[PDB]
Amino acid sequence: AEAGITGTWYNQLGSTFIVTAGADGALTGTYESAVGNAESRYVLTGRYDSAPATDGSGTALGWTVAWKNNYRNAHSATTWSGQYVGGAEARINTQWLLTSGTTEANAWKSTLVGHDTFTKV
Amino acid sequence: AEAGITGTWYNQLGSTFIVTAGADGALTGTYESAVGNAESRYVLTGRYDSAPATDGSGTALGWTVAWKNNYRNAHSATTWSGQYVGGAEARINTQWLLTSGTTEANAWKSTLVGHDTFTKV
Amino acid sequence: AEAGITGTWYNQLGSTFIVTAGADGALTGTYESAVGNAESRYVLTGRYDSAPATDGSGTALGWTVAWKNNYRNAHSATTWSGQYVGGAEARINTQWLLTSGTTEANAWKSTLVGHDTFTKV
Amino acid sequence: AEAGITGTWYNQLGSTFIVTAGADGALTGTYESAVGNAESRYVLTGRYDSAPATDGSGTALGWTVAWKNNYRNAHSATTWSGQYVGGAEARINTQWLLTSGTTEANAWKSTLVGHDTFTKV
Amino acid sequence: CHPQGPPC
Amino acid sequence: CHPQGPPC
Amino acid sequence: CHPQGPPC
Amino acid sequence: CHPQGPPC
């Protein structure tokens, strides 16, 4: 993994994230939503679990993005939890949780769940 | 938030996490599961979205923990997505995703979902 | 279970659901949101898995409610997945998914996730 | 929807479900996992929210399957929450929750989350 | 005021 | 080999 | 137009 | 005894 993870990944919606997997489990990078302007880049940080393991299992990892930068503040944060599978067709399959900050009455509807698959292509 | 977030939090299962909320959205700390031994401390990193906002909304944040340290490697990672609500009775209400690294046949059952509420007490 | 499940349950938000657990896994009833008016009753149907099992495990079950009745059409449906634990303090602990019908562009944000605990009291 | 929903659907894993959408929101059918033997058919019941709506939105629905039949008892139940999109290439996009009955100590890890897309082809 | 919340 | 996966 | 969707 | 549960 690690080496394999470092790089640019694209998801089916048109978002791109560039990440560096450091030697001791760290994931650091930026996530850009669209257009191709600075205004869409957000910091991301996460961790990955290096095993990794002798039977081709994927590498579990997760990262977070708080949707605040110098151009936008969306009062929310998303976490992606998934695994990295390398090889010819390497991908990161994830499920994500997007929570928005609410008042206590609306707290019951503050989190959206979804999924994303990221590829190098 | 920020100031309010920095500190020790406990969840209903007996886990504790100590975190520092830095000026520009970073969350850094450790998560300890139980016993009270070094073997149960894991690094955590996340981000929080400072708004924050004039109508008492909570502060969205999220963090990740890869379950690998010098004593254990559980080949998995958990992300917590939620919001911080301060005040007399401050709490961080979250929903989490725990993904384990699997082979591609077992990938359909690689992620558990749950929820946790953390308090300062 | 079965016998134990049949009855009225209340959740921490003030919603009530009355359900009948039939001999062969069926769950049929109504869910009422608030006020105490017919306009808040919706049909629910689900299934429960009778085992049940010699080591005190809970009874898995799930049900669905489409938010349409003769007074309201919220173009959405919620499914609750959880387990029933009987005894002195019987409860049904669930995690739910609420999906609203969207256009294909907004499909990524069509599902909210949450949790609910229902008691007889 | 309704008419459009009634029929056989297949998901990317090789499972098939046959469902009848009744005039007043009901969904009734069977879910078969694999092989093509009776032992893999389970009853399913759910509801769909007919709107439906003038801007091409999908039809929200959900269903439950308790994994018990005359050949197997897996002490668990799955609920699928999603929307139906008809047309040339009709599909039902869902997110699901699979809960297994646990003892109270293992309750924190009793629910898996995933997603499935079903097509008529 | 989605039917699954309070009130409504 | 949970009934929701392949095969079983 | 939440930053996690397209475009924005 | 996954590190996220009690004890371990």
From Swiss-Prot, chains A, B, C, D:
Positions with a binding annotation for biotin: Y31, Y42, W80, W96, W108
Main location: secreted
Localization per Swiss-Prot or TrEMBL: Secreted
Motif position, Cell attachment site: 47-49
UniProt entry tagged with the keyword Lipid metabolism: no
GO cellular component, one term: extracellular region
Keywords: Biotin, Secreted, Signal
Keyword field contains Secreted: yes
Residue span(s) of domain Avidin-like: 1-121
Source organism superkingdom: Bacteria
GO molecular function: biotin binding
Binding partners and assembly: Homotetramer.
Similarity remark: Belongs to the avidin/streptavidin family.
Function text: The biological function of streptavidin is not known. Forms a strong non-covalent specific complex with biotin (one molecule of biotin per subunit of streptavidin).
Name used for this protein in its record: Streptavidin
Organism: Streptomyces avidinii
Taxonomic lineage: Bacteria, Bacillati, Actinomycetota, Actinomycetes, Kitasatosporales
Shown stretch of the complete protein: 37 to 157 of 183
